[PDB]
Design an enzyme around this catalytic site. Structure first.
Site, short mmCIF file in Angstrom:
data_model
loop_
_atom_site.label_atom_id
_atom_site.label_comp_id
_atom_site.label_asym_id
_atom_site.label_seq_id
_atom_site.Cartn_x
_atom_site.Cartn_y
_atom_site.Cartn_z
N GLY A 16 0.79 -1.22 0.00
CA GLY A 16 0.00 0.00 0.00
C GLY A 16 0.83 1.28 0.00
O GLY A 16 1.22 1.78 -1.06
N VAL A 18 5.39 -1.86 1.64
CA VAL A 18 5.04 -3.28 1.60
C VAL A 18 5.39 -3.97 2.92
O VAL A 18 6.34 -3.58 3.61
CB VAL A 18 5.78 -4.01 0.46
CG1 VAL A 18 5.06 -5.31 0.11
CG2 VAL A 18 5.87 -3.12 -0.77
N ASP A 131 -5.93 4.88 11.14
CA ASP A 131 -6.20 3.83 10.15
C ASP A 131 -6.84 2.59 10.79
O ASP A 131 -6.39 1.47 10.57
CB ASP A 131 -4.91 3.46 9.39
CG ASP A 131 -5.18 2.61 8.12
OD1 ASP A 131 -6.28 2.72 7.51
OD2 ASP A 131 -4.27 1.83 7.73
#
Ligand SMILES: Cn1cc(-c2ccc3c(c2)CCN3C(=O)Cc2cccc(C(F)(F)F)c2)c2c(N)ncnc21
Length: 248
Positions: A16, A18, A131
């Site tokens: 995204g 890694v 997140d």
């Protein structure tokens, strides 16, 4: 360099940067290792290095255990060595349990509580997670719940409005995510599409009548955590101390 010399790659765990699963040759343990491309600009790079120094001091039951961080010249790469968590994350966990009976209230609340406690810890340190979502919530080999990768920087389903629209934001963004996660833990879905149809409704404060009647207390909690106005969302400390968590 160090990565290839000292570790044997096993498999890729996500991209995204890694994240790789890799075995340390010397200690024979498997680790989750994140490789991040370091910014070329001196100022942006210094920001990242400052964040590493802050995070590396963190120690908490809900935070993944940290081992090491180092740089390598390719452009420079930042490597981060964390404890390897289970392959089954919280998203998978809920996917394998699609019926009420497979979602014991007690077990679900205990999971959520650990998440909220890790979040309260970060907030008390002046940090935020940013997140939080089931695909990024993990279990250790010994089944301890961990908030996932954060700092040093997918679906927007768990993301607060102000975060989506790039508005000014505070630690209150984490509270919004917690709200949706609590609902999702307590309300199993038969299909993926039902999951998305219902969650987008919950975000907008429209709840399944069955939920509001089965879980009247969690319902008003979730309602509050999902206020479109961030000032109105409760502090993590207030959530952790809520009555719903009093039965241990
Ligand atoms: C897919 N996947 C991702 C991870 C995973 C989980 C957590 C974290 C990462 C990957 C990268 C950094 N990090 C953090 O929490 C943030 C953190 C905490 C302490 C110190 C530092 C550092 F000082 F800045 F270094 C950074 C994962 C996994 N552990 N097991 C299985 N699978 C995993």
């Amino acid at each position: 360099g160090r990565y290839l010399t000292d570790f044997e790659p096993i498999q890729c765990l996500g991209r995204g940067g890694v994240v790789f699963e890799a075995k340390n040759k010397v200690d024979d343990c498997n680790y989750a290792i994140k490789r991040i491309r370091l910014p070329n600009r001196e100022l942006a790079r210094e920001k990242v290095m400052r964040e590493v120094k802050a995070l590396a001091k963190l120690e908490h039951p809900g935070i993944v255990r940290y081992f090491n961080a180092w740089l390598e010249k390719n452009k420079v790469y930042l490597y981060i060595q964390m404890q390897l968590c289970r392959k089954e994350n919280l998203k998978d966990w809920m996917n394998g349990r699609c019926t009420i009976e497979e979602r014991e209230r007690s077990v679900c609340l205990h999971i959520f509580l650990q998440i909220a406690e890790a979040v309260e810890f970060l907030h008390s340190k002046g940090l935020m997670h940013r997140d939080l979502k089931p695909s990024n919530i993990f279990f250790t080999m010994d089944d301890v719940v961990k908030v996932g990768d954060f700092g040093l920087v997918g679906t927007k389903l768990y993301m607060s409005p102000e975060q989506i629209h790039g508005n000014s934001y505070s630690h209150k963004v984490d509270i919004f995510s917690l709200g949706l996660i609590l609902f999702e833990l307590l309300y199993p879905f038969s299909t993926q599409m039902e999951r998305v149809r219902t969650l987008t409704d919950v975000r907008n404060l429209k709840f399944p009548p069955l939920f509001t009647q089965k879980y009247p207390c969690e319902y008003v909690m979730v309602q509050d955590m999902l206020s479109p106005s961030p000032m109105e969302r409760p502090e993590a400390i207030n959530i952790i101390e809520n009555a719903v968590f009093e039965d241990l």
